[PDB]
Amino acid sequence: DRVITTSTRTWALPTYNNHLYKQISSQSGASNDNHYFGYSTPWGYFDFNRFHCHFSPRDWQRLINNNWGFRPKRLNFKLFNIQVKEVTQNDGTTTIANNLTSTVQVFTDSEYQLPYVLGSAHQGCLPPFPADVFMVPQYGYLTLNNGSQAVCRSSFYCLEYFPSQMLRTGNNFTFSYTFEDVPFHSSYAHSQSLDRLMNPLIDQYLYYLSRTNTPSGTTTQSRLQFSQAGASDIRDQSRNWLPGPCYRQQRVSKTSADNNNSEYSWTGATKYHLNGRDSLVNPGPAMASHKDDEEKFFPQSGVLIFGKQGSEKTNVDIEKVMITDEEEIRTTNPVATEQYGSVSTNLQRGNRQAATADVNTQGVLPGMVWQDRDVYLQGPIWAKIPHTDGHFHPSPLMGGFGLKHPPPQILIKNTPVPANPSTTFSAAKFASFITQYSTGQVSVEIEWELQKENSKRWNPEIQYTSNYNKSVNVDFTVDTNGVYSEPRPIGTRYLTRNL
Amino acid sequence: DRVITTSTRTWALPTYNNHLYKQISSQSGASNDNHYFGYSTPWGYFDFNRFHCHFSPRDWQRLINNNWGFRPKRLNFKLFNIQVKEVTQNDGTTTIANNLTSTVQVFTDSEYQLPYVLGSAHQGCLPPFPADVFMVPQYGYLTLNNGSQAVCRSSFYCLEYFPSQMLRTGNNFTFSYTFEDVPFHSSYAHSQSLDRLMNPLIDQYLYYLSRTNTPSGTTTQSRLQFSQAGASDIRDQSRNWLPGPCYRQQRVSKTSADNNNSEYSWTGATKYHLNGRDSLVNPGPAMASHKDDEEKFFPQSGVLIFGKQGSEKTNVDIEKVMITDEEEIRTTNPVATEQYGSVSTNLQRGNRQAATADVNTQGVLPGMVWQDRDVYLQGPIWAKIPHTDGHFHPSPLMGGFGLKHPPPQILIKNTPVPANPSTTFSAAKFASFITQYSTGQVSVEIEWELQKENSKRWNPEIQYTSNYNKSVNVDFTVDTNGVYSEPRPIGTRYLTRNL
Amino acid sequence: QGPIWAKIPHTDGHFHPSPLMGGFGLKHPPPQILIKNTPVPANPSTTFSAAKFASFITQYSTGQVSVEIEWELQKENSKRWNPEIQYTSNYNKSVNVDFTVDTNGVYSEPRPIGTRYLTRNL
Amino acid sequence: DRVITTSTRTWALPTYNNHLYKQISSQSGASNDNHYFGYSTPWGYFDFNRFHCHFSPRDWQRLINNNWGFRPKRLNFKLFNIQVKEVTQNDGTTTIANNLTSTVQVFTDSEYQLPYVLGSAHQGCLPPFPADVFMVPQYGYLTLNNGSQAVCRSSFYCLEYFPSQMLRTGNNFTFSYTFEDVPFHSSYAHSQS
Amino acid sequence: NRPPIAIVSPQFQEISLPTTSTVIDGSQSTDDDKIVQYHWEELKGPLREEKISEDTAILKLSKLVPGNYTFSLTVVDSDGATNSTTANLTVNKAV
Ligand SMILES: [Mg+2]
């Protein structure tokens, strides 16, 4: 009922901003939806908020083929074997030397006083392959903006204001954290659909309106008739529950000829409108990607899309990305690209026919049930729940564990070391520094709690498995050049449970 | 972490209804939306459900400039120095005398058996200025109605049926109450908006559909392309949360020329339909009053509107009222006068273009966060949560603390004293009484719990402050005639916190 | 951005010793903390010379300095009825935020901030 | 009724005067009101005598909007992570290296035997913004003068005469001080004339 | 300040019948500060009644008869500075 993951990596931290805090904004001209205002800091931070920074692919398979659920319990974070190097360039040459006197400053924001940026799917975690060395990402944040300008409530945080720890070669950093009680992630699909929970052998004792008019000579006549639903009119049965909420997405095909020849990446997107500006909803509320036998379709911005190894940043073709699909939840959640259902629109009578409408948006109703989005090996683990008065079912929409008090941001930076100062006093700000960077090891150890699978089903289940045939390269391995790659996205719903 | 307010006032209680209970209704003719049926009673009641009945303006400033939250803990209520006066008019003159033998009856409805009418923003509390003497309001209530008529489940409550306390001159009344655990009100604005929680320096590892067609010779061709969002396409980033729920309001301008020349106060209003009749939604779900730089616009019935001193009751001009505005919550809640967002409406394909629709109503979705409406110095403190099977996020829409067991209604009335009876028995109901009224002191002491502000921000915050320039009158003071006035509405969100 | 204290001159008489620039007049102020790099001679000649050593190895030092001051306060306790004056940031929009760094990393203090906002009677 | 401020900064101390004490004066010609006579020393000194070396602007606002008075009680001063660098220039190039054997001398004048120059509004404190690195100012002082010349009571102080503390990389310096009873500053205006 | 720059996603709309509705996106228009006003105008086109002349970022054209169209988008600054850009639309009849 427990599994402990441990990951050690080698990081390199450069000096950012040349030690300065700078105001950054879109003040060079942007659309209203793209304006921002914030600060880039000289600090770097540690990001291990992806499952692959902790689970090897084999570990993931062991987890998903055998457990109905799992959730994080505690973590231990360490920084050791730290070394600062000074870089001096003379006559077009580069010399690097060790400085045992310089330090590195480590600030752990355990009181959540700084804007939390982990939880926004940024690229800079411990690499999935343990032999990769990574550059620590620069910490920056955004505040309130009115166009490219700031407003009075806009905040400015200076990190030196807080007490940090100084580390020189030989010193090490340790930090232990306990996760709060959070629900287990559901690593299973349902073997029953919400509209098929009845006993197909017995009729219901309840009636439903089955006919409205009946033959009357040569034409019809209004006459209400009722029936009890059994297996032959299973769609008409009385039920106790409703499918989860929806916020309709546009449907696109993995086959380019099935799509319209126009630009609707934005004009046809599902958006939310906040303080005058639009944002793409992505991935929105947990919905099924497609209905049975339509595996080629997916929600315009309703699924997590990962890049294949070496994929570029912009206007990459569909073969360069790995589109996930949440068809497992189609048993309780609506299909992302279709209406939630239909609803009555008028009042019928002798000279007016019953009219109905499709509902493309459906907020939660009493009696609704649903499954949250799946987590992936290369996806997010947690997110900080926004500090607000109300937050309904705080499960991060990208997937994962919503936490009030998430693992705190661990910020780090190289202490500035002034270059040769003048021999006459100058009040001017020191602007010449000795070029340097640090490097060291980082290890993250997370303890996970498990809910062992205990199915009493008779036939065999579905399990995640490698392809038994021959191949030039093995999946989740390094190629002939030493490059590690993750060939596909691996979800967590293989095992099955009933509804 | 505690602040105790204490307020003493002098009240005058007349005899209402001439001691009778009367049935009241709209049976004189009204619209279907205005019909009612209920009872006016001979009792009066004490209302101290406004912040200004407890906080002096200076106290309010001390509270809002220094705390992130606050909530009521306990209260002590007293009635003392009670005196009954008898009024006799002879030869067109008025004589008032003291009666030490007459009583006043006090009933505290601690078991909530009577219709609770506090919580409907009625005008009759302890005056905000401590030197004002007030008339105790008459207690009345409504029951079920079918037009101007009653129905069988309509209830009639007689208050003498309950055991009350008798008080004559010299007797005093005390009552202590403890508030239930309720969330702290959030007296702060957010320094981050929901669509700007990312690190602007690092790109996301996730992709989004960035283009749908591409140049193909002289025309375009269908081709799906993906990109990772960074700071330049910040609107397209993948996020974990959604803005709070909405129920769209019409937009009106404080500038009369910007508005349409027609009567849409009702025809263009946001309404809810219950059992055949319409009611104005006012103020509905907590939404932002306007988007940045549109301070002149406000939701037709989406904000609390207070009257300036001496403002009349009907068809008062805009200069006579003080329109509040909730622009602080625009960081998480949608703007009251715009769509929640847009949603897909069809299924695009080769010969059909993607179509979308505005969503003017949005029920809660998993992953939604929001801030409740702000409380004001001259606004409501609490409301009784309706006794129902289900009530989602029971925060009174006018603002304040939703309570299951609110401070009980304290009803009071002058005991009737018969005038000279005939000397021969008569079974007829006594209809001649000695004219009188009572008066006395009332003091309410509330203990409030506080969450001290503890911001680690570097630059200075926004604080509520008086205008330092010269003026004929000082704000929140009495004028040359002794009239106290509250010049503006004072909210509670000055301090800032991040999201 | 002004002075905190000043040393009261060591004299026979000093009327109301409150530093005229502002602040706390102290008889025994925080002492001067002086620091200097110890000289390190460069290569000396191999024959004795009584002459004063004039060739040194060029150097400088650097490090961290931290000052922690505990201040005693007299909490405001006004029983006035109307609201007071408070120091506050300007709520309107601006290109830069006050008491922040600009687009180049330069910190600035836009205005002088005094200490007299609250009010007391005479 | 208490608030504790804490400020950490990075300083750089050059060698001043090339290690010499020099007599300085206005002896190059000045007005009678501008004449002086004194000594520039090879020492530097620490100046944190401005409110912004301790209070962030937000801290200041918190202080002034809520208190009628305030006064300093005690202070703790520290020097740590000290490192000496040697600079050698060959062929028009600059090389900097670490010397773990060299020291820095720290003298705290707790008996007030040297001319006190803090208190004359000089520019060289810990920068108000915590990320700024500052140069430590050179200590100098003035004595009696008669025009650009000295007089017999003119004093000359040599700081090596006093016992100082030696610090090499790894050594740190601590100093605690208690302020004397001083009146609270009045952080309020009067509502009556 | 600098004047705003008007941008239109599609500049050569090629929509034919029976498809009668197309769309022009102007939400990409950018400027240093923010844009406060969007204004669409049909400079030329088939003589008809269904005109839009709206003030939205994304323009929705419907009931389009065959012919050539030209729409001019004008964005306004917070200072009052403006800029315009033209869009082309062609509605062909069935084949
Ligand atoms: Mg502009």
Numbering used by the authors:
A (entry chain A), B (entry chain A): 237 to 735
C (entry chain A): 614 to 735
D (entry chain A): 237 to 429
E (entry chain Z): 405 to 499
From the reporting publication:
The more highly saturated binding allowed single particle processing with icosahedral symmetry, yielding a reconstruction with an FSC0.143 of 2.4 Å. A single domain was revealed, fully consistent with the tomography and SPA of the PKD1-5 complex, but now resolving the backbone trace and most side chains, allowing assignment of the tightly-bound domain as PKD2. When B-factors are refined, they account for the expected higher disorder in the receptor ligand (⟨BAAV2⟩=15.2 Å²; ⟨BAAVR⟩=27.7 Å²), and occupancy refines to 0.59. On receptor-binding, AAV2 undergoes only limited conformational change. The footprint of PKD2 on AAV2 straddles the plateau that extends radially from each threefold axis, beyond two adjacent spikes. Arg585 and Arg587 (AAV2 numbering) interact electrostatically either with glycan sulfates or AAVR Asp459. Concordance of the PKD2 structure at 2.4 Å resolution with the ~10 Å view of PKD2 from SPA/sub-volume extraction and the ~30 Å cryo-ET, both from complexes with the entire PKD1-5, argues that the atomic interactions revealed at 2.4 Å are not an artifact of using a truncated PKD1-2 receptor, as does consistency of the atomic model with distances expected from x-MS with the five-domain construct or a near-complete receptor ecto-domain.
Infection starts with AAV’s attachment to serotype-specific glycan ‘primary’ receptors, followed by co-receptor-mediated endocytotic entry. Recently, through genome-wide screening for genes essential to transduction, the cellular protein AAVR was implicated as the key receptor for entry of a panel of AAV serotypes into representative cell types and, in vivo, in mice. From N- to C-terminus, it comprises a signal peptide, a MANEC domain, five immunoglobulin-like PKD domains (PKD1-5), a transmembrane region and a small cytoplasmic domain.
